[PDB]
Amino acid sequence: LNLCVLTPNRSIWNSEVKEIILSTNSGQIGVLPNHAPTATAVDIGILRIRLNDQWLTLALMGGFARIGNNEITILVNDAERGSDIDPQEAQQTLEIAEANLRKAEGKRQKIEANLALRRARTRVEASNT
């Protein structure tokens, strides 16, 4: 199955894979080869590609995914190799974002604080992974 992870600039991982499991807007769905058709949008969260050996998580920041027939066109809003993040730096930044969220008033600014709290939370989440 062809997992094509692609940010709108960088094709993050066009690595065709054996299995995968990630968090959609549906929240939790494993990817078994040749399930019947769907295209999806992801929540801002890690993406455990269970390609044949490695259950490989990758810090997706949301985006959409056309899951074609053995072809996962992952069009991510952002996407990190979850090992590539320094976990302590992602944790310091997530702490910074949480402090920014507690401090951040305003409708737009508070909502952005929540959105990046989710984003940095997924960053720290796959940074743990």
């Binding site: 909502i111 959105l115 990046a116």
Partner: peptide, 9 residues
Amino acid sequence: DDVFSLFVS
């Protein structure tokens, strides 16, 4: 995201 919040606003 700045624009998205300032437009959701």
